[PDB]
């Protein structure tokens, strides 16, 4: 019942290969709904989920104007951060930003977020109080002073507690058939002999939404955390996700192993065994 909205910005310089590219993507939980790419033939905010299409021309124009302004602002920021770190004009650098709001199962604002990174390292982040900043170093301290003078934290707090929550609730309503529908994993256990004395037990979870899931293997009721090969949760390409957990078991000992599945879409958690 918990929901979140996030925007992910990536600004990447490419000296000798034109101006920095700016891409913005918007998500509601694990569903992308908008994109903007400064490298597109005609850069404009584009729908990426059917429930956002009903938004009028003023919505699309408002989004496009914000992201076009961001493209220019981020190009200046890349120049500034190059300077703050005494970097040469030769290297390619990346600024990333992720911000948004989290709602509880009551629809109330749980917390707001606004974090920025430089070359994949934390740079500056809005604290949970939505009033103060955490600057990673002396370079980020310059950004902090600039952001305090512009009153950014106060503007962000108004957005995070206001428009962010308001728009997220609107999207949750407009896309309730998908966004508020939890698809349970379809589960099974496969058996793969690895040798005469050992076999792999692989516990599968397919077609689930949202991505959050827990897949564990237990031997005689005790967690096999160190022995479990756990793949990263992966997108199926149709909104759903996939994951598997594997254990190498001594041949003949298969019934001492149980796979445990926890997901929001399930009426009750699952306990599965290999079924020969």
């Amino acid at each position: 019942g918990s929901h979140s909205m996030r925007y992910f910005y990536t600004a990447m310089s490419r000296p000798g290969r034109g101006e920095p590219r700016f891409i913005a993507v918007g998500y509601v939980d694990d569903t992308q709904f908008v994109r903007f790419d400064s490298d597109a033939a005609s850069p404009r905010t584009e729908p990426r989920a059917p429930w956002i299409e009903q938004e009028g021309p003023e919505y699309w124009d408002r989004n496009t104007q914000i992201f076009k302004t961001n493209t220019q602002t981020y190009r200046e920021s890349l120049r500034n951060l190059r300077g703050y770190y005494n970097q040469s004009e030769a290297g390619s650098h990346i600024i990333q930003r992720m911000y948004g709001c989290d709602l509880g199962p009551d629809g109330r604002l749980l917390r707001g977020h606004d974090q920025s990174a430089y070359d994949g390292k934390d740079y500056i982040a809005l604290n949970e109080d939505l009033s103060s900043w955490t600057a990673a170093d002396t370079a980020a301290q310059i950004t902090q002073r600039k952001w305090e003078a512009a009153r950014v934290a106060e503007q962000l707090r108004a957005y995070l507690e206001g428009l962010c929550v308001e728009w997220l609730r609107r999207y949750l309503e407009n896309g309730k058939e998908t966004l508020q529908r939890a698809d349970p994993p379809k589960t099974h256990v496969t058996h793969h002999p690895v040798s005469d004395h050992e076999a792999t037990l692989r516990c599968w979870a397919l077609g689930f939404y949202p991505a959050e899931i827990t897949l564990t293997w237990q031997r005689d009721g005790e967690d096999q955390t160190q022995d479990t090969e756990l793949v990263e949760t992966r997108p199926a390409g149709d909104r759903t996700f996939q994951k598997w957990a594997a254990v190498v078991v001594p041949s003949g000992e298969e019934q001492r192993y149980t796979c445990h599945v926890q997901h929001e879409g399930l009426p009750k958690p699952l306990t599965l065994r290999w079924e020969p």
Partner: peptide, 9 residues
């Protein structure tokens, strides 16, 4: 809807 204020770093 995204945040509408763009502030240079």
């Amino acid at each position: 809807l995204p945040f509408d204020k763009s502030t240079v770093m």
